[PDB]
Design a protein around this ligand. Structure first.
Ligand SMILES: CC(=O)NCc1cncs1
Ligand SMILES: CC(=O)NCc1cncs1
Ligand SMILES: [Cl-]
Length: 115
């Protein structure tokens, strides 16, 4: 069902190594809906190549646009399992501290802060 379940650790590692070789300026991000989540839609895909200069505040703007949300729909984003301390951090810096051992940056969204 989830990305980690669909691909072996070996497979996730090799895919990140390909993104490094073919899209060296991009951050490999997994973005998944919370398994509880009722309100917000599912995305058209799971694996995203994010430009390494965008900060977390702009990535939230991007995901809201991709989900085609309106002004009063609530949106919460967990990174590597927990809340973001800051949305002003460049994703290149967030990646280096919050990346998984497979080399993806894992994110989960919901309409409640209570995930
Ligand atoms: C394409 C690519 O990055 N793979 C090389 C690596 C093998 N050992 C660590 S990374
Ligand atoms: C569009 C692109 O190149 N990657 C950034 C994205 C992150 N989440 C949705 S797309
Ligand atoms: Cl690139």
């Amino acid at each position: 069902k989830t990305f980690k379940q669909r691909r072996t650790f070996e497979q996730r590692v090799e895919d990140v190594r390909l993104i490094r070789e073919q899209h060296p300026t991009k951050i490999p991000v997994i973005i998944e809906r919370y398994k509880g989540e009722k309100q917000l839609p599912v995305l058209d895909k799971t694996k995203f190549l994010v430009p390494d200069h965008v900060n977390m505040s702009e990535l939230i703007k991007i995901i809201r646009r991709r989900l085609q949300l309106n002004a009063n729909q609530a949106f919460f984003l967990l990174v590597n399992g927990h809340s973001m301390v800051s949305v002003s951090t460049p994703i290149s810096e967030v990646y280096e501290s919050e990346k998984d051992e497979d080399g993806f940056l894992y994110m989960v969204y919901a309409s409640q802060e209570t995930f």
